[PDB]
Amino acid sequence: LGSGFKAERLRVNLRLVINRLKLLEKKKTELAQKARKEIADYLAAGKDERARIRVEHIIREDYLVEAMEILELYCDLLLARFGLIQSMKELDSGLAESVSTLIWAAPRLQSEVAELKIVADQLCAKYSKEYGKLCRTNQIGTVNDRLMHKLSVEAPPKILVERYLIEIAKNYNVPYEPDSVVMAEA
Structure with missing residues (x-):
């Protein structure tokens, strides 16, 4: 039968992921300034x-x-330690976090970083579809907790929303009074 694992396709796509993440970090940061200004316009109006x-x-x-900066680190680690993937059949204990986290992150980010799907599919080819499914849900228990937190699709806490508006309002010198109850119960 045989293996779907294509090591060189994994290596190429890891580098492409790193460059795509570096590009999106910069672009998103710049877009964020525009968005804060728009929030200030809202507040000025009020x-x-x-x-x-x-x-x-x-x-x-x-x-x-x-x-994205975390994921960039993990891709760079796998590139650096690539010999451990391609030359050995078992998953290296020290790479488990990087591999599992990339597989978990792929669905979440593939819409903006298409090559991350290819990275994860190849890691799943290498380490099994069964392992891959346990990673995508973190049933495997090795996905980086800080990363998962940053990619949580949970609505932000009210206090965080208030803190962001407070800071934007300060920075643009527009009026804003926070929800006092939210502030008190923090």
């Missing part, structure tokens, strides 16, 4: 309720850029 909803995107994007 569409408080609308700002509280819309600012959730900025929070998610800020967390995403930090997740």
Whole structure:
């Protein structure tokens, strides 16, 4: 029968992922400044309720850029230690976090980083579809907890929303009064 694992396709796509992440970190950071300005325009007008909803995107994007930097590290590690993948059949204990986390992250980010799907499919070819499915749910228990947190699809805590609006309002010198209850219960 045979193996679907194509080591060189994994190696190429790991590098492509790193470059794509470096590009998206910069682009997203720049876009985030524009978005903060738009929130300040909301506050100046003084569409408080609308700002509280819309600012959730900025929070998610800020967390995403930090997740991308983590993923960049893991790709670079696998490239550096690539011999351990291709020359040995068992998953190296020290690479388990990097491999599992890349497989977990792929579905979450593939819409913007297409080559991450290829990286994960190849890691699944190498380490089994069964292992891959346990990674995508973190049933495997080795996916990086900080990374998963940054990519959480949970609505941000009210206090975080308030803290972001407070800071944007300061930076643009526009009025804003935080939800006092939210601030108190923090």
